[PDB]
């Protein structure tokens, strides 16, 4: 399971995969969540940007890295 209780997700994105950013929740605009972690319940009427990962925008999921977020998140994998 994609659960990562007690630590950061750190799941590396692949080309073509969805990445989730939130204007208000994200510390900065490099702060991202993977599909397994992003919980819509955390972001009702938030300005959520879901992009498709390309060759350029390569990185990792920030779920569970509390320094990357302004609000406490509730991992979707944990459900
Ligand atoms: Zn994740
Ligand atoms: Zn997570
Ligand atoms: Zn949000």
UniProtKB/Swiss-Prot annotation:
Zn(2+) 3 binds at residues 22, 25, 43, 46. Zn(2+) 1 binds at residues 4, 37, 63, 75. Signal peptide: none annotated. Changing residue 59 to R/D: Abolished ability to degrade proteins with type-1 N-degrons without affecting ability to degrade proteins with type-2 N-degrons. Zn(2+) 2 binds at residues 9, 34, 37, 61. It comes from the Eukaryota. Zn(2+) 4 binds at residue 47. A zinc finger (UBR-type) spans 7-79. Ubiquitin ligase protein which is a component of the N-end rule pathway. Recognizes and binds to proteins bearing specific N-terminal residues that are destabilizing according to the N-end rule, leading to their ubiquitination and subsequent degradation. Recognizes both type-1 and type-2 N-degrons, containing positively charged amino acids (Arg, Lys and His) and bulky and hydrophobic amino acids, respectively. Interacts with UBC2. Interacts with RPN2, RPT1 and RPT6 from the 26S proteasome. Belongs to the E3 ubiquitin-protein ligase UBR1-like family. This is E3 ubiquitin-protein ligase UBR1. It comes from Saccharomyces cerevisiae (strain ATCC 204508 / S288c) (Baker's yeast). The chain holds residues 115 to 193 of 1950 of the full protein.
